[PDB]
Amino acid sequence: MVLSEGEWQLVLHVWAKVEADVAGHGQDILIRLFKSHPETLEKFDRFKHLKTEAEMKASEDLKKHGVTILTALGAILKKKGHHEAELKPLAQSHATKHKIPIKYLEFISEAIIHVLHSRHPGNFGADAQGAMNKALELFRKDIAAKYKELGYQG
């Protein structure tokens, strides 16, 4: 798929708001993911024990990782589709070391859209949401194709 420039603008205009507080957004997102789809919590041997949302909010580690996720995603979005290089190492560690099913990349895509909608209603109307959705679908389709090349499937 190809996003137009007007779609990329809508995605990079709400991402610039997310970058004013990356640690807060990365925390909200991960918690939204772990409450909605608790099975995803099992993939993190590092956070697995966290039992409540309050524990999650207090974990500094969890907040550090949220910043790692959003920094890597932001670097991919800012490429505006030319992200092949960035994708490579990310597809290799998530398909071979962490074993993360595409299904779980959809679940986090859903958590990102829920959090931007709650924090940025004015910059995240229907057109901007459609554009963000298109950009994450593009990210998931390219990762899925690398997963096949790398041998991960089902």
Of the residues 35, 46, 88, 148, which one makes contact with ligand HEM according to CB under 6 A? 46
C-beta of 142: minimal distance to ligand HEM in Å? 12
> Cα–Cα distances in Å, from 151 out to 10, 96, 99, 103?
35, 9, 11, 17
82 is in an annotated binding site: no
Question: Which C-beta is closer to ligand HEM: that of 56 or that of 100?
Answer: 100
| Enclosing H/E stretch for 66 | helix 60-77
Separation between Cα atoms, residue 50 and residue 59, nearest integer Å: 8
> Cα–Cα distances in Å, from 3 out to 39, 86, 112, 154?
32, 18, 19, 29
Binding flag, residue 75, ligand HEM (CB under 6 A)? no
65 is in an annotated binding site: yes
| Enclosing H/E stretch for 5 | helix 5-18
Binding flag, residue 43, ligand HEM (CB under 6 A)? yes
Q: Which stretch binds ligand HEM (CB under 6 A): 10-18, 39-47, 77-85, 125-133?
A: 39-47
**66, 29 in Cβ contact below 8 A?**
yes
Looking only at residues 91 through 150 of this chain, which bind ligand HEM when binding is defined by CB under 6 A? 93-94, 98, 100, 104-105, 108
Binding flag, residue 4, ligand HEM (CB under 6 A)? no
Residues annotated within the binding site are 65, 94
